[PDB]
Design a protein around this ligand. Structure first.
Ligand code: HEM
Ligand SMILES: [O-]
Length: 153
C-alpha cells in the first residue's frame, strides 16, 4: 500500500487537478485517444471525433473528462479503502464497456503525462512516485475484479 506520507502527496497533487477538473479531464482523454486510437472506438459517442481539433472543441468530451476525474478523485480520497467505490467501476468497465486492463494502464500513463504538461517543474519526483503508486493500486484492484469476472477484452 501507500504510506501516510505518500497519500498526502497524492492528495496534494490532486488539489492541482481539482482547480481545473474539466481541463485536466479533457487533456487526459485526448492524450489517451490520440496516443491509442483503439480506445476511441470504445466510446460510440466519441467515434465521430476524427481530429484532435474536433476533440478539443467537444464539450461532451470535457463533460466525460469531468465524470472520469470526479470518480477517480473520490476513489483516491479513500486512500485505498475504496472497495465500494471501485468494485462497480471495475464491473461496469469490464462487463458493459469492455475495457481491457491495458487501456487502464494507458489512461494512468496519460494522467502522469498531463500532470507534467500542465504543471511543468511543479510535479516533483516524490509526487510522481506517490501518484504512480496510487494509480497502480487503482489499476491493480480493478485487475483483481476483472480476474473474478474472467474478463480480458
Ligand atoms: C481513471 C480511469 C477511469 C475512470 C475513473 C472512469 C470512470 C467512468 C465513469 C464514472 C463512467 C460513467 C459510469 C459508468 O459507466 O461506470 C464511465 C463510463 C465509460 N467509460 Fe470510463 N473510466 C475510466 C477509464 C476508462 C477507459 C480507459 C475507457 C476506454 C478506453 C473507458 C470507457 C468508458 C466508456 C465507453 C463509458 C461509457 C461512456 C458513455 O457512453 O457515456 N473508461 N467511466
Ligand atoms: O471513462
Amino acid at each position: 500500500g501507500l504510506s501516510d506520507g505518500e497519500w498526502q502527496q497524492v492528495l496534494n497533487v490532486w488539489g492541482k487537478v481539482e482547480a481545473d477538473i474539466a481541463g485536466h479531464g479533457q487533456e487526459v482523454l485526448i492524450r489517451l485517444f490520440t496516443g491509442h486510437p483503439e480506445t476511441l472506438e470504445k466510446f460510440d459517442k466519441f467515434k465521430h471525433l476524427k481530429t484532435e481539433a474536433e476533440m478539443k472543441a467537444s464539450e461532451d468530451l470535457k463533460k466525460h473528462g469531468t465524470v472520469v476525474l470526479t470518480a477517480l478523485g473520490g476513489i483516491l480520497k479513500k486512500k485505498g479503502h475504496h472497495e465500494a467505490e471501485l468494485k462497480p467501476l471495475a464491473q461496469s468497465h469490464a462487463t458493459k464497456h469492455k475495457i481491457p486492463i491495458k487501456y487502464l494502464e494507458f489512461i494512468s500513463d496519460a494522467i502522469i503525462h498531463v500532470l507534467h504538461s500542465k504543471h511543468p517543474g511543479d510535479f516533483g519526483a516524490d509526487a510522481q512516485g506517490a501518484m504512480t503508486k496510487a494509480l497502480e493500486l487503482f489499476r491493480n484492484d480493478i485487475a483483481a475484479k476483472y480476474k473474478e469476472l474472467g474478463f480480458q477484452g
